[PDB]
């Protein structure tokens, strides 16, 4: 079998807001599989979200990012008038600083060719042939990606904080997100285990599937 | 210990030996009475150190005191290092080190 594609990721600032965190911008410690899947789709310029269902992703944290809060005058659709003062509310948003991680992409379960792994490999091979819009970001549109590159299993050859699918884990990261409400959002429970493995364990792989 | 810390400790020992010599000279000078004062000598030294207002005056006083100390074996062993430390360092830091040496001084039993 083809070795799973490894994508080194370095982001200066990242906000993985929680699904139920609407009054305050609480963030996940680790990028959810849904956010990484959306980032990869943006990287290959794929607008359709159902195109690459079945891809498996594994995330290894190269360091523990620090959590910080920033005030923000975020807008909302509360009043019909755009200039009404009710449309602006001040609330906190939690950000993560200096996020470095390695992403494993495995595309054995995809039924549509070419697979997401092949598309990412081709995009990195010939960047001038990639047809996409906007700037690559992880989280919010203003949180641009500093370094995204093809790496090996030992890019830093140090110690890795894996995200293991544990039913007793603390984090509840979604592998599918319903942006309207929460009906179609699908969750999985993870834990961050400090391990010196250079390849993801079996429980570290998360398959992105439709809620159906 | 870094080299700067080593020179700082050597300077502390040099100043302590100089105070030993000066206080021995005083003790020999005022053998009369029940006992020559010790706290008064330390207060005199602190006042004279605090009197210095600029680099030249403080370094002149420090050199005079060091010479009045006597042999000062720690200066014998470390001519260049301690000499360069005194010449180069800001006089306020040298005064701080001298006062630390004063505070950490043990009179001979």
């Amino acid at each position: 079998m083809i070795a799973p594609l490894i994508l080194y990721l370095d982001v200066p600032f990242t906000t993985f807001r929680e699904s139920h965190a609407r009054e305050m911008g609480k963030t996940y410690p680790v990028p959810p599989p849904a956010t990484v899947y959306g980032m990869l789709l943006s990287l290959v310029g794929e607008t359709n979200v159902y195109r690459h269902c079945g891809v498996e992703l594994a995330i290894a944290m190269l360091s523990s990012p620090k959590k910080s809060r920033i005030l923000r005058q975020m807008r909302r659709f509360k009043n019909a008038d755009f200039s009404h003062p009710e449309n602006v509310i001040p609330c906190y948003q939690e950000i993560l600083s200096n996020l470095k991680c390695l992403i494993w992409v495995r595309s054995d379960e995809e039924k549509i060719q070419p697979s997401l792994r092949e598309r990412i490999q081709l995009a990195f091979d010939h960047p001038e042939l990639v047809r996409r819009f906007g700037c690559l970001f992880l989280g919010e549109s203003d949180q641009l990606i500093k370094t995204i590159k093809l790496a090996r299993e030992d890019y830093l050859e140090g110690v890795r904080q894996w995200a293991i699918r544990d039913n007793r884990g603390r984090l509840t990261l979604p592998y599918w997100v319903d942006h309207v409400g929460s009906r179609n959002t699908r969750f999985l429970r993870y834990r961050i285990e400090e391990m010196d493995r250079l390849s993801p364990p079996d429980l570290a792989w998360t398959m992105v599937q439709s809620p159906i | 210990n870094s080299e700067e810390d080593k020179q700082y400790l050597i300077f502390i020992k040099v100043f302590q030996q100089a105070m030993k010599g000066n206080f021995a000279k005083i003790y020999a000078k005022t053998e009369e009475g029940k006992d020559p004062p010790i706290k008064k000598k330390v207060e005199r030294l602190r006042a004279e150190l605090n009197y210095c207002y600029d680099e030249l005056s403080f370094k002149e006083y420090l050199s005079d005191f060091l010479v009045r100390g006597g042999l000062n074996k720690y200066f014998n062993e470390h001519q260049e290092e301690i000499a360069l430390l005194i010449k180069k360092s800001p006089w306020q830091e040298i005064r701080i080190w001298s006062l630390l040496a004063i505070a950490s001084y043990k009179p001979k039993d």
């Binding site: 370095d10 200066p12 600032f13 990287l43 607008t47 620090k66 959590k67 910080s68 809060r69 920033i70 005030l71 923000r72 005058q73 659709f77 755009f82 200039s83 003062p85 001040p90 950000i95 600083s97 200096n98 995009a123 960047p127 001038e128 990639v130 047809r131 996409r132 819009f133 906007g134 700037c135 690559l136 970001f137 549109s141 203003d142 949180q143 641009l144 990606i145 500093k146 370094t147 995204i148 590159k149 319903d178 942006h179 309207v180 | -």
Partner: protein
Amino acid sequence: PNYYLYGTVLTRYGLASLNHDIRRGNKTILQKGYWNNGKIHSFVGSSAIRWALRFYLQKQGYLVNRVWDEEEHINRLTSEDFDPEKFYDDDIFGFALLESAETEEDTSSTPNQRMGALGMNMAVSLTPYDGAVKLGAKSGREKDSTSLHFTEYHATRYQYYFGIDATHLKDFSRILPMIDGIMNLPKVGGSSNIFNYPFCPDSLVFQWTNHFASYISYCFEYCDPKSKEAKLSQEFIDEVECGQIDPSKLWIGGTIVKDLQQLDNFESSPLNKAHIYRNRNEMIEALKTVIKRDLGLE
């Protein structure tokens, strides 16, 4: 063929109280968070710089949908239906409509939304923040409340990272006014009455490339708090020497040029073949010539 313009810009040294946080008693807290080596640096939100660019575009003609009413200190919309083909503001910064939040697709048919072609990361202080406050007692013998306040300030330089998908623009020629605004940034929202902090750049590392990634996001750092030397980061130079970040795609200007030239072995360094200009205007003119040639704006 996509064409992206990424850039890291460093601001001049000065006293800054730009973004601020929720107040606590008399103290107007500067907003801050962790950064490199775990130290606390003062931040400037990305929305602040985007607002500054919006106001720059509004201030010099450049018909914009979101007009800022200076008299009433409120934001007004000329057209409820955003039209990126006509307005610079909607074309560059994008928009989001009411129906954009109650549906999954991007159409509902007129477009429901538009991802802004420009995205800028938040500005962080080049130097770790040390608690510095200013007294604010107002004149007069009548000493009631609302007097004797404290304002937090920071005497360092700020750096931020931006990126634009020039191909994503509805009108390709709109990138030039945005560049002019980035260099001639009027004021990033803050206490300009008490702490007037010009946000005009004094050191740039721009990259005009067709690659979706640019490893030049934060190339300026000196740390050693309470200083303003602002040397180029060692990891950025190492990545330039490694082989990625093609030097022919790099554009370096400002006061960092002097330090770069003063470096030994710089003549034989791979960083030498980058477009390096001490004058920011000259570098911007050359870069805009290249951009116009590549995008067909001629």
